[model samples]
Target: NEELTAEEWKRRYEKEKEKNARLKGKVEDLEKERDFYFGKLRNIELICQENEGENDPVLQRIVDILYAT
Candidate 1:
């Protein structure tokens, strides 16, 4: 039978907690970046709409291309 000592268990728990914290921080940063890019895209769409006119086919195509994968 194998059993972890108290110190070993404590160290493992600490390491896992640190790893999780780091991952959570990375996720938060990515979310912020996503929001920033999304806002910029929205602004660009609005500007393109205002300048090119509402019914411009070219603008519509451009926006679609910008968003489409």
Candidate 2:
């Protein structure tokens, strides 16, 4: 087996570290977006329940579209 030189090992480690960092950042961003949308959905549901039986056509349509998307 060929042994890797110190410089080669350092370069490989750095590349792997950078790739992992980028993936970690993407995951964090997605989690934050998920939480924000989850909160929005909860709030919309609450409002809909509170105004049940009222002709909330606009709010209903907005909620439906959001959910569909």
Candidate 3:
């Protein structure tokens, strides 16, 4: 079912590659920033653990909020 000519196919491929190149840097930064958020959240969770015991009501509520959608 290949209907397009070679020149047409090559033009489409170049168009797609140009768009991907423009977005490549944006995707890498998004990934890096997400990693930063994950590490920061883990640190917060650890501090919450040590500063407040597992059974404390306020701690429980805050933890629920943090982990909740």
Where is model 1 more than 4 Å wrong at Cα? 51-57, 66-69
What 10-residue stretch in candidate 3 is worst by lDDT? 53-62
lDDT by residue for model 1 over 1-69, one digit each (tens)? Answer: 499899999999999999999999999999999999989889988888787755788888878967898
Q: What is candidate 2's TM-score against the reference?
A: 0.64
Q: Comparing 2 and 3 by TM-score, which wins?
A: 3
- Supply the global lDDT for candidate 2: 0.89
Instruction: Give TM per candidate.
Output: 0.71, 0.64, 0.71
Candidate 3 TM-score versus the reference: 0.71
Pairs of residues at least 3 apart in sequence or in different chains that clash in candidate 3: none
User: How accurate locally is residue 13 in candidate 3, as Cα lDDT from 0 to 100?
Assistant: 100
Alpha-carbon lDDT, every model: 0.89, 0.89, 0.87
Clashes in model 2: which pairs? none
Q: Please give, for residues 1-69, the per-residue lDDT of candidate 3 as tens digits.
A: 769999999999999999999899899999999999989888878877897845788877777877998
